[PDB]
Paper text:
Hafnia phage Enc34 encodes an unusual endolysin with an N-terminal enzymatically active domain and a C-terminal transmembrane domain. The crystal structure of the catalytic domain of the Enc34 endolysin shows a distinctive all-helical architecture that distantly resembles the α-lobe of the lysozyme fold. Conserved catalytically important residues suggest a shared evolutionary history between the Enc34 endolysin and GH73 and GH23 family glycoside hydrolases and propose a molecular signature for substrate cleavage for a large group of peptidoglycan-degrading enzymes.
Further experimentation revealed that a truncated variant of the ORF39 protein containing only the conserved PHA02564 domain can be readily produced in a soluble form and without adverse effects to the cells. This C-terminal deletion variant of the protein, ORF39ΔC, was therefore used for the subsequent studies. No electron density corresponding to the bound substrate could be identified in this structure, but due to the higher resolution and better resolved protein loops it was selected for reporting here. The crystallographic asymmetric unit contains two protein molecules which are represented as chains A and B in the final model. The two molecules have an interface area of 591 Å2 which due to its small size likely does not represent a biologically relevant assembly. The overall structure of the ORF39 EAD is all-helical and consists of six α helices (α1 to α6) and a single one-turn 310 helix in-between α5 and α6. The structure can be regarded as two overlapping helical bundles, the first of which is formed by α2, α3, α4 and α5 in a roughly antiparallel arrangement, and the second consisting of α2, α5 and α6 with α2 and α6 running parallel to each other. The overall shape of the EAD is roughly globular with a large groove between loops connecting α1–α2 and α3–α4 and centered on the C-terminal end of helix α3.
Residue numbers in the entry: 4 to 169
Write the structure that this text describes.
Amino acid sequence: SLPRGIRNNNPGNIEWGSPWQGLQARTAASDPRFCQFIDPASGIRALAVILTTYFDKRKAADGSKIDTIREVIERWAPPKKNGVVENNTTAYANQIARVLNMQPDDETLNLHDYETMRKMVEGIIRHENGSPEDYDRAPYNNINQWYSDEQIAEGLRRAGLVKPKT
Ligand SMILES: [Cl-]
């Protein structure tokens, strides 16, 4: 059994809410909680756009700017309003900061930069879905491991991001 995000062409595990381009019609057989996309490029594109919507916000709930990996991941993976106190959001931010080789409170973060967005998207995909080797698949030689470099690039291109090339 593949992870839910990969089965759904929704490797970010985006919850139903916005009618992203490339969604399947929702039916009685649909995933009850998470978006299902017709192709991986559409799911990857939606993930890049969601992260851009957070980054483009001036201020977070806590009153602080949204201009750092910590503040972007706080929006992406928010804690619950009540129930058991748990620090999954802090661990998630630290893990993505390691993927970017940046400190979580570095305010030079630019998610309009192709390479920065690529590393954050790929980090989230690998975090949400685990190792392809755990599902008896060969990982691709990249951060995300589930999708080819070409599949990641097509998602990001569709989200408007420009990789400088020679
Ligand atoms: Cl790059």
